[PDB]
Amino acid sequence: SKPQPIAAANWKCNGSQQSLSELIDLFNSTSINHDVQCVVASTFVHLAMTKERLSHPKFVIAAQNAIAKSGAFTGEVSLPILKDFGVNWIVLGHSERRAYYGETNEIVADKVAAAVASGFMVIACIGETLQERESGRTAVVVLTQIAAIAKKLKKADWAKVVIAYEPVWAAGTGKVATPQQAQEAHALIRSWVSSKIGADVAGELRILYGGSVNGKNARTLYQQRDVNGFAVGGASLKPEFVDIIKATQ
Amino acid sequence: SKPQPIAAANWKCNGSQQSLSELIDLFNSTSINHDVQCVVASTFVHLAMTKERLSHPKFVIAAQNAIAKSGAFTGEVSLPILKDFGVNWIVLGHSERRAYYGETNEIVADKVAAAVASGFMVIACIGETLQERESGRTAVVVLTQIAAIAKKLKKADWAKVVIAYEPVWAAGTGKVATPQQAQEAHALIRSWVSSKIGADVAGELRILYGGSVNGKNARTLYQQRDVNGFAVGGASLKPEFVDIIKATQ
Ligand SMILES: [K+]
Ligand SMILES: [K+]
């Protein structure tokens, strides 16, 4: 059967003290009857508030980015700073950082390896753009992305690693990913891990769908063989995120 | 007479909850007699603990970076989020962000303009590299940087703008600029502001020096005609910062 599902809330660069606290109150009051690891990834600024307010046993807190080491890097946040601050989860290599902030396949790989070495649970993000998919390069792109990450990891490190597939080709492009299209991408990633890392690792690896979801389509998406949860964007700032949690059973 | 001096502490990407707490406790117990605006720019993560424990009346809290608007920008922090969090000061266009994180002259200018429009006090960083100075291109490089900023500002905006002249070759290298080198650069900057923006604006404009400032060289640096304070990196993580504050007369 599937490993423990994950419902990750990527709040991105959003939220006020009031709006986020209200949403945290809803999460705290939400009863969850099945084994699922829920994750709340707030901005660095809201990490303190989230730590103090979030109390649900099946919820942990994550950062949306970091650099490997502390030092002369004005504006950035390092892994030791997050570790000292009690944050043990992190989202790395998000498509927006790959696009906007110069994070190459190797830069993402270095951050992930650094985070794992520091003891973090890591949600590593991969996925192809519309240009790459339409040019028939979905497979080569996503496999190159995860190959770069694996190059800096050992087999034992994958116990701390989570893979999130972002259908970037469907992000504000007008396109819509079908459950079949998502499954095909997940199965492809699964197949690579099995042959390159191990069938044991592949069986335990959580592959999260990182595309647009609501309560309804998330239930359908979780029916797919190689979908192990969701890395949610916009819907994670809404009460709808509760439905997405329930979508993982 | 000089305008109100500024002692800015740029902790950069450093510090634990404990180490920064000790710095703050020292700052709180430090008697500051003269008129000076002290600034502490911690990481996004430590903003909350700084707001809570820092209570010295002549100290304000700053961010080390931001982007203009909230939205789908994973890992980043926006100006509206900082404003909601009660943070009203910010350092922008630091040499480390110009070099590592793709912040061009025009990118810096847009952030500065956005910050001023949102009601922030802005410490805008400019400065030349080692090669640019030794090739005798300090003037054209530094003045081009502030010109790009100036293009995006109305005259009224300069009241919220603080200029930090920070030569890259002096950043953390232990090679502080001589009082003459700093004065020469500050005089050049204020002269350009006087001619292009107005003599009234230039008379009120604060020009800080940044680059290996410590408790031993600060006093002599501030004695110069056009030096209105300091942007401090490494020494701002030490008790030495108190001596730099007092060095502003
Ligand atoms: K969504
Ligand atoms: K968003």
XYZ file of C-alpha atoms and ligand atoms in Angstrom:
500
model
C 0.000 0.000 0.000
C 0.908 3.694 -0.057
C 3.204 5.254 2.565
C 2.035 8.004 4.938
C 0.324 10.766 2.913
C 1.318 14.431 3.198
C -0.842 17.548 2.995
C 1.475 20.540 2.628
C 0.282 24.143 2.802
C 2.490 26.468 0.760
C 1.286 29.913 1.812
C 3.951 31.449 -0.442
C 4.493 35.192 0.007
C 1.100 35.876 1.588
C -0.749 36.545 4.820
C -1.282 38.979 7.663
C -1.011 38.294 11.389
C -4.806 38.312 11.630
C -5.652 36.286 8.515
C -3.081 33.565 9.204
C -4.003 33.243 12.885
C -7.662 32.770 11.923
C -6.625 30.020 9.487
C -4.443 28.389 12.144
C -7.395 28.433 14.556
C -9.422 26.533 11.956
C -6.618 24.004 11.521
C -6.369 23.530 15.293
C -10.102 22.874 15.600
C -10.098 20.432 12.678
C -10.333 16.758 13.625
C -8.246 14.451 11.438
C -8.975 10.744 11.838
C -6.292 9.177 9.629
C -2.495 9.002 9.531
C -1.373 12.027 7.530
C 1.485 14.480 7.990
C 0.166 18.015 7.530
C 2.704 20.763 6.859
C 2.369 24.541 7.142
C 4.959 26.525 5.191
C 4.669 30.205 6.093
C 6.955 33.111 5.251
C 10.017 33.537 7.473
C 8.260 36.463 9.164
C 5.272 34.388 10.273
C 7.323 31.437 11.543
C 7.294 32.725 15.131
C 3.528 33.271 15.176
C 2.880 29.894 13.546
C 5.095 28.124 16.091
C 3.224 29.614 19.037
C -0.292 29.231 17.624
C -0.287 25.935 15.701
C -1.106 23.141 18.150
C -2.611 20.336 16.057
C -0.680 17.062 16.649
C -0.719 16.124 12.956
C 0.718 19.483 11.889
C 4.354 20.520 11.508
C 5.870 23.811 10.363
C 8.127 24.433 7.369
C 10.120 27.206 5.731
C 9.728 27.995 2.025
C 13.455 28.453 1.365
C 16.944 28.640 2.887
C 20.631 28.815 2.046
C 23.146 26.252 3.300
C 25.223 28.293 5.753
C 25.019 31.453 7.847
C 27.228 34.347 6.767
C 27.491 37.503 4.679
C 24.305 37.004 2.671
C 22.069 40.008 3.396
C 18.355 39.256 3.104
C 18.654 35.466 3.191
C 17.929 32.877 5.886
C 20.226 29.920 6.602
C 19.551 26.344 7.717
C 21.279 26.690 11.114
C 19.064 29.708 11.829
C 15.952 27.663 11.040
C 17.234 24.688 13.041
C 17.932 26.918 16.044
C 14.438 28.365 15.591
C 12.910 24.895 15.865
C 11.883 24.548 12.225
C 12.523 21.006 10.985
C 10.667 20.967 7.655
C 11.450 22.885 4.470
C 10.310 23.368 0.880
C 13.204 23.616 -1.582
C 13.570 24.167 -5.315
C 10.057 25.514 -5.840
C 9.319 26.362 -9.482
C 9.024 30.062 -8.645
C 12.527 30.086 -7.154
C 13.871 28.133 -10.129
C 12.260 30.731 -12.401
C 12.730 34.015 -10.536
C 15.710 33.584 -8.228
C 18.360 31.730 -10.217
C 17.962 28.322 -8.589
C 19.377 25.800 -11.067
C 19.122 22.007 -10.814
C 22.477 21.917 -9.022
C 21.746 24.834 -6.685
C 18.544 23.076 -5.627
C 20.493 19.837 -5.182
C 23.071 21.526 -2.947
C 20.393 23.088 -0.736
C 18.538 19.776 -0.391
C 21.687 17.845 0.533
C 22.622 20.567 3.016
C 19.143 20.456 4.545
C 19.173 16.662 4.880
C 22.661 16.749 6.416
C 21.310 19.279 8.908
C 18.532 16.814 9.748
C 15.642 18.488 7.925
C 12.668 16.752 6.370
C 12.747 18.104 2.822
C 10.016 18.654 0.259
C 12.044 18.887 -2.949
C 10.133 20.340 -5.900
C 10.483 19.373 -9.563
C 8.404 19.866 -12.712
C 8.468 21.008 -16.336
C 7.168 24.205 -17.959
C 4.667 24.540 -20.809
C 7.484 25.117 -23.299
C 9.252 21.968 -22.102
C 6.109 19.812 -22.153
C 4.921 21.044 -25.558
C 8.386 20.348 -26.969
C 8.008 16.767 -25.751
C 10.640 17.147 -23.048
C 8.621 16.342 -19.917
C 10.563 13.157 -19.162
C 14.085 14.467 -19.773
C 13.467 17.626 -17.725
C 11.931 16.025 -14.627
C 14.415 13.136 -14.627
C 17.341 15.536 -15.017
C 15.964 17.542 -12.090
C 15.729 14.576 -9.715
C 19.002 13.097 -11.005
C 20.806 16.264 -9.932
C 19.302 16.024 -6.447
C 20.134 12.321 -6.116
C 23.748 13.014 -7.107
C 24.284 14.792 -3.780
C 22.382 12.237 -1.696
C 22.999 8.760 -0.317
C 20.391 5.988 -0.229
C 19.748 6.481 3.493
C 19.079 10.200 2.974
C 15.875 9.532 1.018
C 14.112 8.720 4.290
C 14.155 12.475 4.918
C 13.226 13.447 1.362
C 9.810 14.155 -0.152
C 9.283 14.796 -3.871
C 6.723 17.316 -5.105
C 5.801 17.325 -8.792
C 4.747 20.769 -10.007
C 2.799 20.801 -13.262
C 4.300 24.215 -14.072
C 2.789 23.885 -17.547
C -0.615 24.297 -15.882
C 0.317 27.211 -13.608
C -1.552 30.266 -14.893
C -1.074 29.039 -18.455
C -4.729 28.247 -19.090
C -3.950 24.533 -19.117
C -5.479 21.986 -16.742
C -3.802 18.798 -15.545
C -5.903 15.636 -15.620
C -5.556 12.880 -12.991
C -4.092 10.701 -15.756
C -1.471 13.306 -16.682
C -0.476 13.690 -13.028
C -0.248 9.923 -12.518
C 1.929 9.537 -15.615
C 4.392 12.078 -14.222
C 4.396 10.487 -10.763
C 4.831 6.963 -12.139
C 7.754 8.188 -14.241
C 9.473 9.627 -11.168
C 8.678 6.447 -9.227
C 10.204 4.286 -11.963
C 13.435 6.290 -11.991
C 13.889 6.126 -8.211
C 13.283 2.368 -8.248
C 15.958 1.661 -10.863
C 18.456 4.329 -9.776
C 18.118 4.336 -5.983
C 16.149 1.232 -5.025
C 12.725 -0.401 -5.131
C 12.673 -0.181 -1.338
C 13.215 3.585 -1.448
C 10.719 4.045 -4.287
C 8.059 2.205 -2.293
C 8.552 4.485 0.710
C 8.974 7.737 -1.218
C 6.150 10.261 -0.968
C 5.463 11.894 -4.323
C 3.187 14.893 -3.811
C 1.088 16.576 -6.482
C 1.922 20.283 -6.508
C -0.718 21.585 -8.893
C -3.964 23.496 -8.405
C -6.466 21.488 -6.359
C -9.815 21.837 -4.629
C -11.661 19.412 -2.355
C -13.273 17.526 -5.231
C -10.416 16.996 -7.686
C -7.980 16.197 -4.872
C -10.038 13.134 -3.952
C -9.851 11.979 -7.570
C -6.133 12.772 -7.783
C -5.365 10.799 -4.619
C -7.010 7.744 -6.192
C -4.017 7.568 -8.536
C -1.437 4.872 -7.780
C 1.594 7.132 -7.367
C 0.006 10.169 -5.712
C 0.933 10.389 -2.028
C -0.593 13.738 -1.120
C -0.499 17.386 -2.118
C 1.736 20.439 -2.041
C -1.015 23.044 -2.198
C -0.634 26.636 -3.360
C -3.557 29.059 -3.389
C -6.123 26.761 -1.788
C -3.876 26.393 1.274
C -4.748 29.953 2.322
C -8.419 28.976 2.432
C -10.659 26.773 4.621
C -10.740 24.542 1.514
C -7.359 23.155 2.628
C -9.227 21.115 5.243
C -11.040 19.319 2.412
C -7.676 18.664 0.755
C -6.477 17.016 3.967
C -9.584 14.818 3.965
C -8.876 13.976 0.314
C -5.944 11.863 1.518
C -8.512 9.741 3.417
C 25.790 71.236 10.911
C 25.051 67.608 10.048
C 21.625 65.958 9.847
C 20.699 63.297 12.425
C 23.324 60.510 12.377
C 22.453 56.830 11.918
C 24.086 53.725 13.376
C 22.775 50.763 11.394
C 23.391 47.187 12.519
C 23.274 44.726 9.629
C 23.405 41.274 11.211
C 23.077 39.796 7.715
C 22.354 36.057 7.642
C 23.578 35.357 11.174
C 22.637 34.788 14.795
C 20.794 32.416 17.088
C 17.931 33.201 19.455
C 20.424 33.223 22.327
C 23.309 35.191 20.802
C 21.050 37.906 19.392
C 19.209 38.099 22.715
C 22.474 38.942 24.480
C 23.237 41.667 21.935
C 19.790 43.168 22.464
C 20.170 43.073 26.255
C 23.413 45.026 25.905
C 21.769 47.518 23.543
C 18.884 47.988 25.985
C 21.268 48.730 28.859
C 23.322 51.162 26.775
C 22.825 54.834 27.619
C 22.781 56.973 24.480
C 22.859 60.697 25.216
C 23.110 62.333 21.792
C 20.566 62.395 18.966
C 21.102 59.352 16.753
C 18.810 56.878 15.006
C 20.032 53.362 15.758
C 18.857 50.596 13.434
C 18.881 46.813 13.859
C 18.365 44.787 10.681
C 17.905 41.131 11.629
C 16.859 38.220 9.428
C 13.145 37.801 8.705
C 13.084 34.923 11.207
C 14.378 37.003 14.123
C 12.140 40.026 13.516
C 9.547 38.849 16.043
C 12.024 38.223 18.865
C 13.642 41.591 18.149
C 10.318 43.451 18.280
C 9.595 41.849 21.640
C 12.922 42.248 23.433
C 14.423 45.404 21.892
C 13.076 48.347 23.890
C 15.744 51.051 23.589
C 13.966 54.301 22.567
C 16.613 55.275 19.995
C 16.462 51.919 18.209
C 14.264 50.906 15.283
C 13.988 47.555 13.517
C 14.723 46.962 9.835
C 14.409 44.231 7.231
C 17.434 43.275 5.134
C 15.386 42.783 1.961
C 11.889 42.544 0.488
C 9.966 42.324 -2.760
C 7.330 44.856 -3.799
C 4.110 42.831 -3.591
C 2.611 39.735 -1.983
C 1.789 36.731 -4.155
C 3.199 33.598 -5.773
C 6.809 34.193 -4.758
C 7.781 31.193 -2.624
C 10.506 31.928 -0.082
C 10.309 35.712 -0.398
C 8.906 38.412 1.898
C 6.880 41.399 0.675
C 6.590 45.016 1.826
C 2.899 44.712 2.801
C 3.748 41.720 5.007
C 6.554 43.669 6.694
C 4.290 46.693 7.164
C 1.617 44.524 8.783
C 4.328 43.093 11.037
C 5.161 46.591 12.282
C 8.527 46.831 10.540
C 9.040 50.281 9.030
C 12.733 50.311 8.107
C 14.543 48.348 5.408
C 17.940 47.868 3.786
C 17.786 47.506 0.002
C 20.262 46.890 -2.796
C 23.023 45.549 -0.566
C 26.201 44.582 -2.438
C 25.668 40.936 -1.499
C 22.235 40.943 -3.148
C 23.601 42.848 -6.147
C 26.273 40.177 -6.613
C 24.574 36.930 -5.579
C 20.859 37.431 -6.129
C 20.546 39.281 -9.430
C 19.603 42.723 -8.129
C 20.623 45.134 -10.892
C 20.651 48.927 -10.554
C 17.108 49.021 -11.928
C 15.888 46.189 -9.695
C 17.218 48.031 -6.644
C 15.590 51.256 -7.837
C 12.183 49.595 -8.168
C 12.372 48.108 -4.670
C 13.424 51.442 -3.162
C 10.566 53.278 -4.892
C 8.089 50.600 -3.814
C 9.308 50.768 -0.218
C 9.046 54.561 -0.077
C 5.557 54.368 -1.588
C 4.591 51.965 1.207
C 5.826 54.345 3.906
C 9.184 52.718 4.667
C 12.388 54.432 5.708
C 14.956 53.108 3.247
C 18.698 52.581 3.545
C 19.742 52.242 -0.101
C 23.169 50.722 -0.716
C 25.594 51.807 -3.433
C 29.287 51.053 -3.918
C 32.026 50.030 -6.335
C 34.102 46.846 -6.509
C 37.873 46.564 -6.075
C 38.436 46.432 -9.835
C 36.167 49.419 -10.468
C 38.122 51.586 -8.018
C 41.608 50.555 -9.145
C 40.557 51.137 -12.757
C 39.458 54.627 -11.733
C 35.767 54.041 -12.409
C 34.400 54.690 -8.909
C 32.614 57.907 -9.884
C 30.806 56.568 -12.954
C 29.816 53.326 -11.202
C 28.575 54.815 -7.922
C 26.771 57.770 -9.508
C 25.104 55.488 -12.069
C 23.757 53.374 -9.204
C 22.166 56.328 -7.400
C 20.964 57.812 -10.703
C 18.980 54.654 -11.452
C 17.414 55.012 -8.008
C 16.788 58.733 -8.557
C 14.860 58.100 -11.788
C 12.179 56.202 -9.865
C 11.818 58.805 -7.113
C 9.940 62.074 -6.776
C 11.647 64.857 -4.804
C 9.518 64.217 -1.708
C 10.736 60.604 -1.522
C 14.288 61.563 -0.533
C 13.028 62.496 2.937
C 12.553 58.757 3.489
C 15.816 57.782 1.802
C 19.152 57.110 3.476
C 22.180 56.472 1.265
C 24.740 53.894 2.368
C 28.027 54.147 0.485
C 29.421 50.632 0.811
C 32.550 49.829 -1.237
C 32.527 46.109 -2.051
C 36.269 45.757 -1.421
C 35.663 46.834 2.186
C 32.757 44.471 2.872
C 33.939 41.960 5.470
C 37.472 42.012 4.064
C 38.952 43.880 7.021
C 40.092 46.567 4.597
C 38.276 49.651 5.867
C 38.323 52.795 3.736
C 40.457 55.639 5.067
C 38.553 58.699 6.361
C 39.768 60.460 3.206
C 38.520 57.799 0.783
C 35.117 57.765 2.486
C 34.845 61.563 2.611
C 35.840 61.853 -1.050
C 33.098 59.422 -2.060
C 30.478 60.988 0.214
C 31.345 64.454 -1.098
C 30.960 63.155 -4.651
C 27.554 61.635 -3.898
C 26.141 64.684 -2.105
C 27.443 66.959 -4.868
C 25.565 64.921 -7.472
C 22.410 64.948 -5.343
C 22.806 68.707 -4.886
C 23.119 69.357 -8.621
C 20.571 66.842 -9.905
C 17.956 66.663 -7.145
C 18.480 69.925 -5.268
C 20.704 71.646 -2.719
C 17.939 71.414 -0.116
C 17.636 67.633 -0.503
C 21.408 67.119 -0.400
C 21.636 69.160 2.796
C 19.229 66.844 4.594
C 20.412 63.602 3.000
C 22.116 61.104 5.314
C 25.122 59.382 3.732
C 26.405 56.425 5.744
C 29.655 54.547 5.245
C 29.720 50.758 5.300
C 32.698 48.430 5.091
C 34.763 46.980 7.940
C 33.676 49.673 10.393
C 34.744 48.857 13.947
C 35.006 50.520 17.353
C 38.527 51.730 16.593
C 38.086 53.455 13.224
C 34.497 54.705 13.539
C 35.245 57.945 15.409
C 37.809 59.209 12.897
C 35.535 58.182 10.020
C 32.611 60.170 11.411
C 34.774 63.269 11.928
C 34.649 63.758 8.154
C 32.484 66.499 6.643
C 30.029 64.338 4.697
C 29.846 61.205 6.855
C 26.486 60.906 8.618
C 26.852 57.502 10.257
C 27.589 53.856 9.546
C 26.228 50.628 8.132
C 27.885 47.952 10.254
C 28.169 44.247 9.489
C 30.525 42.052 11.495
C 31.096 44.502 14.344
C 27.325 44.828 14.767
C 27.314 41.228 16.007
C 29.692 42.252 18.797
C 29.558 44.492 21.907
C 31.820 46.728 19.809
C 28.707 48.174 18.134
C 28.053 50.290 21.236
C 31.358 52.081 20.640
C 30.358 52.746 17.029
C 27.115 54.354 18.209
C 29.003 56.699 20.540
C 31.455 57.444 17.723
C 28.703 59.415 15.971
C 29.380 62.314 18.377
K -4.717 25.231 -5.135
K 0.125 33.411 -4.122
